[PDB]
Amino acid sequence: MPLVALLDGRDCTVEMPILKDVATVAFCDAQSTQEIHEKVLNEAVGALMYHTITLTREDLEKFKALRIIVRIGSGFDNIDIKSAGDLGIAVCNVPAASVEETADSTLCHILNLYRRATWLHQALREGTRVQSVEQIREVASGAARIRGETLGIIGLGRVGQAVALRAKAFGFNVLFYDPYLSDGVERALGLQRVSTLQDLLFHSDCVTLHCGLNEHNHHLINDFTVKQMRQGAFLVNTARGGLVDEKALAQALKEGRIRGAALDVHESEPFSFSQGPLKDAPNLICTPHAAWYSEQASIEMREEAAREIRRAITGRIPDSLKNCVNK
Amino acid sequence: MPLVALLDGRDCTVEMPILKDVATVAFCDAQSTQEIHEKVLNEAVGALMYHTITLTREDLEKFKALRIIVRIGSGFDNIDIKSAGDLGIAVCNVPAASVEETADSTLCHILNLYRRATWLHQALREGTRVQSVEQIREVASGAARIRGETLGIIGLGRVGQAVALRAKAFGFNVLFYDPYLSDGVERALGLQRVSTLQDLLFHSDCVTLHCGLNEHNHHLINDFTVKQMRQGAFLVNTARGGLVDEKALAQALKEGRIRGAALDVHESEPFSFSQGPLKDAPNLICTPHAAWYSEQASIEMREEAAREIRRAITGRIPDSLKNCVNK
């Protein structure tokens, strides 16, 4: 039976009943390609993977039998996809399993910035006593009324759309910028669209990222673009860490140009509050790439991924695949 | 000019331009009646107050000239209202200034329980390193998919309604219980209504409190009713601390019968994580009675309160009052 390897993990229990009579399944628990056994590189026909390992062209060439990579999850910036296709390797993803989880975590982050719940909780853990109204106003200082505020969405695909719909219900005015959609989706969903990133950032009280990370948007938020954002704007990122220059973000937080930021993703993951450019930044909320996570979403995407592998092996690449992203 | 006293605060700057030519304004910065100067008790014609001081009949009798109490805010459980009216004292509130602030903080709490953002942030502050997917699943364990879950709302007045509308947008199935509304409001807003508290608690995955605290609902949530809630249900309280028996809540958190609770209000305020029945309870998020707070809401309710005082003094009690709650 063909070999299929789980690259950056150990647990295969969900995939096993689907793949039993179809593939031999192995895991590598690998943080990098230098940690994969020679057998896998030599023999693996398929590969399952998350976001915690990167495949450059170098890495892909080390595989001598590999015909399919399936990401367990939606983002595939961590695979050099064009090179994979040149090397005759089909790459797929799982686009839909965690859309609402991610939108809900996004809304949770937005609300946490506006209503300061996480910071107020921290404050209480720290032993701050809040006895008088005056003290409530001070400890909660910066907490703001949402109705009439403008949420700017960068990228209006699955998550951005789920986010927009939720945001309307709190009285946000929602703008988006997405240079790759054909026109009319703004009408369909009753949103306002803007042509440029700069228009979005200029008009937005809270800016939230929901685009894939691609060759053209590394450090989309940087020293230049940060300077285009409203004074005292919020920033939210549950998309990809590489869309933001943490050095510019940090300075901006220190200087108060950005009032607060909520980040589930980071340039270098795992994230620590003790290492990197963000080390000392005030007004920062962070989560460990967990916006996607629910038990149902985890199970859902694992089973769909397993099936995609099965379809690869059992049928015809790339015809038998539902979610190949480099045909 | 008549004397008007701000009882449990110092700052009068917002009220002053409205009350200048109408009343002499004083403050008491009082946590209790035993802290108010004799002049105020003797002469005060009106009183402005928050939630941090209580007026029993005893306290109200100590006032010899007092004709109006205006709460700066909506909840008036902290004033013995019936006795005030007997003693010839008009009591008013400010019902509308912070409805959406409170609904938004409520949604923030709900989402924080389901998506664990606050706890995940804490975790990162504590130096937990979350490198692998397996580690993400463990640190985020308990994070759940919202669509199809049931939110049970107890009290469907202003805040409960704003909460319900927001919750629909995340795919919550919304039930409410409110024994004082006439029928049909459920149809108007497209919700499901249940007849008893027990029906609500039985069917609800997350239970959220939005009723006034009154003579009939002290410890609404207690040893008995806690036992009626779903196993692993969440509880949210931005209403009043006295609706919940923290002793039963605590045990329930320890035993895992309630999976998590988010509390902006508490039996004894200010709240400390080092004192009281909740001291050791796991899975607890808390905020220092700040759900109401935004700068606009604060200003809004202060100006409206001031005007109500002005209307009291300038015109006819109780006819000239917009928000007298004991006519």
Ligand SMILES: NC(=O)c1ccc[n+]([C@@H]2O[C@H](COP(=O)([O-])OP(=O)(O)OC[C@H]3O[C@@H](n4cnc5c(N)ncnc54)[C@H](O)[C@@H]3O)[C@@H](O)[C@H]2O)c1
């Ligand atoms: N934190 C998490 O756990 C988590 C979970 C799910 C998705 N994500 C990330 O969030 C991203 C969004 O997810 P999705 O499912 O909505 O993806 P999607 O493909 O459905 O939508 C992405 C949208 O971004 C747009 N876009 C691309 N580049 C852009 C740019 N420079 N400016 C503006 N718009 C741009 C595309 O046109 C597309 O409409 C994913 O790529 C993924 O990496 C993170």
Ligand SMILES: NC(=O)c1ccc[n+]([C@@H]2O[C@H](COP(=O)([O-])OP(=O)(O)OC[C@H]3O[C@@H](n4cnc5c(N)ncnc54)[C@H](O)[C@@H]3O)[C@@H](O)[C@H]2O)c1
């Ligand atoms: N944490 C905060 O900062 C904050 C802010 C605003 C309000 N609050 C509190 O939340 C409460 C709700 O605010 P609101 O403006 O919606 O009040 P509201 O008067 O508009 O609505 C309260 C509703 O609760 C219902 N009710 C009363 N007793 C009940 C019971 N035993 N079971 C079920 N329903 C019951 C009433 O019928 C009413 O419809 C207020 O009384 C206030 O104390 C807290």
Ligand SMILES: CSCCC(=O)C(=O)O
């Ligand atoms: C199962 S990890 C996936 C998380 C993610 O960020 C993505 O897929 O886009």
Ligand SMILES: CSCCC(=O)C(=O)O
């Ligand atoms: C301005 S404090 C008011 C807060 C509150 O809980 C209420 O008014 O109901």
